[PDB]
């Protein structure tokens, strides 16, 4: 069993970072009229830790007894779509963004179905029940309009906890009626604290300097930090400060992509780097993640008078990739513009 | 009683004005029996339904109007079902009374899918000597080019103020309202050549403020006056960023104006200003960027300060050019 | 009760069609021979796909046309039961036909049919091909599946070159003795744009509307933006002049033109304008971007002003 | 009883309870004697009480006997479907009763339908609403409630009477929130109340919901600035001073540090655009610098409205405020 | 000069100030009876036109199905090994149903018909979406199979050949799966044909079905078969137009035979774009009319994206590549917005995308224009990667699927997991292992039991065995151009696999004991 999820907290008092938000949420769920929640922050900050912790504090013992159900829905076109559901006897958890263009269909039908379902022995447990919408940000406009309709009509019997990142694409009038809970990414010292705790439980003597290296290469992402710690334990048990940390294959692939860019400024190297971009894109990783990795591994090389225009073109081609439908044209346009600007930079 | 728009629908080819060529060609078509299928396209509220209904009531009596004219629009469900329903069933059959061609009047015809347009254009080809269609639409560009290759297209165009005043004067004569000299000018400017908005805003400020002046209709409609836009552009080209931003946000909060109307009136004011050509190119580029920028749902104050920002760059440029 | 010119001057034989000369000649070779393969005819509207398929079916069958030819169209219902029943038991039927002549199912506007309709189509046209042959007509091949274009022979009809449109137009005009001006007839070409039925209807319409066929009459009964005004607009955008082009813009906006038709005629004039090739590419890209601004729902005069500003700044 | 939120609980109820909106009372008071009115559209920030004003107004025009029979109230964001626009309004106008009451008072013979929050509808739904207003212009009158003008389309606003609803502008909300705090036994100082007014631009309902949320988190503790800054979606001011200190002079390493230190905190980039815009338009920067920074803030808010990545765009926005601040 | 600091004489004016305040004002004033695709249908196995491996594989599958209905007793070696991967005790193959797929017009139906006629089966056909209700599909699915023959002393049996189930409604594939998974028993082989392999209705079928993905036909046998057809029909033997024609249609037999039957494009447009012919407005109008008459723009743009950088470009500013990329992205934006706004006015611009390339890449040098499009292969690889990651996240139990996103699992929690699952272990026996290795094996077997993955043996084509992952997760984590890490040994992998199976019966026994 991995220690990333084995030593996960259960109660709100055994949290390692953001104690004040933990106390605020504990006193919020201590009284009645628990409102609609919109939890947000960066990836790996620990939103879902707060969410199952809130579910632990809201209910009794049976909060981690989860199972997968499969529910079929019908589009206006005659086609059956099977959707997945992570559910318990006290709550619901749905990812509704897996259905791309039929997100309004599932957002109407599935929560109409669970709203029309009656809580058996409702006097014993609590007043209402909670529904998690795990990936909610990339839902489209009228899907989120049906979502706020669902929030309005079953306000007495079904409150929702929407979890996402980058709420700019989340519509305004769902943010008005939802209590906004913001979970920041843990700092370098809090990541070092929880790494030292997860090593002290498992009989380990991690030096502080290697914990700083793990925190600074995890880029404020605790799950990735604990996975690096696990992989470092697998690689070598005697821990030295000068330790080779096993970085993930797509980051070092982006590093090789970036040094293939800065090596040559010719169309043949552009063909090679377009092949590398295709190999990166075929693994179903998001192109904004590729863009961010390219800019992070690109700013370690370029001169100080050229970082600003490079960053502006990075934002420009990420935005036009979001407006478009095929990623490789905008990505290789960004790479071609960077090569043209760099060869103008060293040519003069 | 009713609103003035429904009380004065021109019932006679005499009452309507400023559409005399459409009048002459359609009466020339209908007297010699050479009327083709019609496609009437233009802005809203320039009288598309009124002329075809008066023409259909000119052809037929009231006692035979029910079997020679079928009226549909988009209030009903429209698509592939009702083209294979009432439309061709009316079109393929004869007349219950006497003899002659029939009429289908389809209001707001640009709201159907292109499959429905293909079904309807084949229906138009199949039955022509016994059915004469009439499709009223707002935009021509929502209609497939073969359908425009069937039915002759008539453009109504704008309602010019010099033949928009006397109908408003006639409804003023019939229904007594307190209206000053600026009332006709504000009616023919504010309604944007749409006479359905003219008789709706006339009833709105008659019921609301009683008297009809420039100030009453501009405060009821919420439009900014020319003095307001002159003050806004004077603050943008005169004061610094804090003072101009504070002045315009105070004026916009007090008067309840909207940034889209401010942008439109400012654009219609820029070409009055004798800007240098590069500065006007800068202004039109940035203002078109802002008007696309409001269309997605951005925060209005930030685009307001963006307009102030572009005008601050311009005032530095004109002084640097002077 | 005279018939319109679209149906009166329809061709009755396969050599009167001026659309695609090699395809028409091969269709006549198949009409005189008999073993016509499964064909699909694609192209823009008005090229004459329907009259080519109808003339091929007539010259094949002759007196047995009323029983050996099934014309299914867009105005008829084309559900799953229709391709299950009507097309199937037409393809299963027997007709006493000659040695080379074959049954014909004219499937006009096949791009508008649903996916299950084509799913029930495919087996039928593969199996019953010893007796019945499918002659599909369509506008865009993208809405039809690739297997149907595989089992058919695809016949791309081009947009008509203006010379053959002129030859047919002198044929119709000499058949009617309608007076004309030359530049008015070129205006009828400009209003056609590869749509020959549109050219015939606009000529028809225009003569019935106003005697002499002159640029003024056809441009009055059509009321598109004038080519001279939009061409002078693009010329004023070439030499970096926002103001002189904006008087033309205000002229076309106070005339009541919708922005969609303004930007469509702007692109259509910019297609054939005599300017630099890379400059034409940049102009077409900016006109396309403003056309997406229009199509997304921003139809102001300021979008036209920003289009003019972007065309002005792209010429230094 | 159920815990009622204090927005609809504390809304006005009668015609004269509207807190100085006597023009909206007077136009109708004229319409009582005139017995005729066109379509209506009330636009204004929420919590003002347009819906309660038109409910009491229709109660004055019909009476409690005819209120449940002649007034149909629908929420447009609850009825965004094109079917329920084109079926329920048709069924309401088709079922007609006479305009005569048992009390003997005269009554105008047209129906009343209300569509609340109609600005959230799309273009096609609003076009279908325009069609429903077009075909039912004889037997059923239309009134709409919205918060913004241009979200309602131009054909929908060309056939109605537009009424601006002004809220409690200044110096009334602070003591009102103090009465709510003393009624529910809530301890909150003057600066917290002033910050509650300041975080919402003219919005009462936002202030009541933020006070409800802060009292729910504290549960009886002091409402400090940190809790209100957390709930109202405010970046703390020291983060903006750190951003301006990093972007004033130095290298791109400190910007990347503060941008990656602003995304990590969980802050929305639109909130940075709003607050950074607020601190640029009020500071003592040059006009060219203020202009370039604010134009880029508008462009960044545009692309965040289009769904672009916040990280790269805050990097580019901080890069151009660095290139404007260092020079 | 448009600006005067002096106040206008008698017209209106607007003030302009600066940061200094100069205050300048602005002025406000049966040879001929059947087709050539029908007369040239191969009636025997000798004259088939497909890959010989595919025909042999399907012939061996229908030759091994003969046990229960007659009573008679690289990717290629993977397919051959699952062909001979044992038999079910009720004498059925482990691969009950075939799922041949591919592009149109290769001969899947012809191959299936002649193989069914070769293996002693009376052919019977099916179109799936022809009859799209569950009930008629159910009636035909238990009528075509599950039955004997009425003729004489047995006669010959029938095997069901379902065509066009790629577009079948999901209830029909559900009925077929429920009739396949019954354990009154399915006895006749079912031969399904699907055009799109990655259809969402077909995803549950492949996991059980036999798969024979059709490779494209080699052009040399295409050319000589078309030459045989031309010499039999009396057509002139011109192999250049046959090779070009077959290159244009992506090696589709229906298209070339129908075109040569009609006779008594892509490469021309590509050659006009990428090489000037041996005024500039004249070739501009010529390539514009060629791009307008090309019609199909999706494959043209897809091939232009896979060829515009392979030219011998001497650009010293890479400006042309940037402009071509902006043009391609503009076409992408415009196609997406024309899909969103449903406007046909925008559909006249993508003909200007290849034309622009002719202004940018009019290379005089003879261009190496490559017909296969790597964008299609990249889309297919991305799609099969997507099916693999949904299969993986379906593999997880709800306990962990809950803790993390599949996006976060793919980006941040899978390669490090593999690196955890690939430790350094000596190749010794489990009893000779120490205590620390024993609890490390306990941690590894707990991680595999929670993630539901195992190691399965397979035959390397050299004759020996090797052990692989059960969902083969390394192809979505590792990358080809990386420094390769040392994999686990054979002995460690097999001892871990026996520990996996031992823990599986262990947890089964404890779950039986608790209940
Ligand atoms: N030329 C005109 N002369 C007099 N009154 C006119 C004229 N044009 C419009 N009107 C008035 O405008 C009212 C509305 O006219 P309609 O024909 O219904 O508008 P429309 O042209 O159909 O546009 P729609 O229906 O919104 S697409 C009529 O009842 C007339 O009173
Ligand atoms: N090549 C041609 N030569 C002569 N007349 C033609 C030609 N093409 C079209 N026409 C005329 O235009 C009329 C309409 O032609 P159709 O064949 O119906 O057009 P189409 O090819 O079917 O395109 P659609 O159906 O509108 S998409 C015919 O009746 C002819 O009078
Ligand atoms: N060896 C061959 N030589 C010549 N023609 C052949 C040969 N084998 C098959 N054909 C013909 O070519 C076609 C074979 O393709 P089909 O199997 O019918 O279509 P398909 O390959 O299944 O692809 P789709 O998706 O059904 S269009 C048939 O028309 C056969 O008559
Ligand atoms: N106090 C803590 N103790 C141990 N682990 C923690 C703690 N806080 C967060 N984590 C770890 O950080 C990771 C954050 O993942 P998650 O909650 O999914 O955040 P996100 O939803 O943003 O990806 C979790 O896997 C969790 O194990
Ligand atoms: Mg009308
Ligand atoms: Mg046709
Ligand atoms: Mg098939």
Author numbering:
A (entry chain E): 2 to 349
B (entry chain C): 19 to 340
C (entry chain B): 34 to 349
D (entry chain D): 35 to 361
E (entry chain A): 165 to 193, 276 to 319, 346 to 455, 480 to 560, 585 to 598, 627 to 863
The authors write:
CTF18-RFC, an alternative clamp loader, localizes to replication forks during the S phase and forms a complex with DNA polymerase ε (Polε). CTF18-RFC has recently emerged as a specific clamp loader for leading strand DNA synthesis. In this cryo-EM study, we reconstituted the human CTF18-RFC–DNA–PCNA complex in vitro and captured seven intermediate states in the PCNA loading cycle by CTF18-RFC, including an apo state of CTF18-RFC before it encounters a clamp, two states of CTF18-RFC bound to PCNA, and four states of CTF18-RFC and PCNA interacting with the 3′-ss/dsDNA junction.
States 2 and 3 represent binary encounters between the loader and the clamp, with the 3S-binding mode (state 2) and the 4S-binding mode (state 3), that differ by having 3 versus 4 clamp loader subunits that bind PCNA. In the binary CTF18-RFC–PCNA complexes, the A-gate between the A′-domain and the AAA+ module of the CTF18 subunit is closed, and the binary complex becomes more compact transitioning from the 3S-binding mode (state 2) to the 4S-binding mode (state 3). Transitioning from the 3S- to the 4S-binding modes (states 2 to 3), RFC4 reaches down to bind at the interface between PCNA-2 and PCNA-3, reducing the vertical distance between RFC3 and PCNA from 33 Å to 17 Å. Interestingly, the transition from 3 to 4 clamp loader subunits binding the clamp (3S- to 4S-binding mode, states 2 to 3) involve only rigid-body movements of the CTF18-RFC and PCNA approaching each other. In the 4S-binding mode (state 3), in which 4 clamp loader subunits bind PCNA, only the ATPase site in the CTF18/A subunit is in the active state, the arginine fingers from the adjacent subunits weakly interacted with the bound ATPγS in the B and C subunits, and there is no contact of an arginine finger to ATPγS in the D subunit. Interestingly, we found in the 4S-binding mode (state 3) structure that the C-termini of PCNA-2 and PCNA-3 interact with RFC2 and RFC4, respectively. The interface between the loader and the clamp increases progressively from ~1,600 Å2 [the 3S-binding mode (state 2)] to ~2,400 Å2 [the 4S-binding mode (state 3)] and to ~3,900 Å2 [the 5S-binding mode (state 4)], Therefore, we suggest that the increasing surface area of interaction between Ctf4-RFC-to-PCNA drives PCNA ring opening.
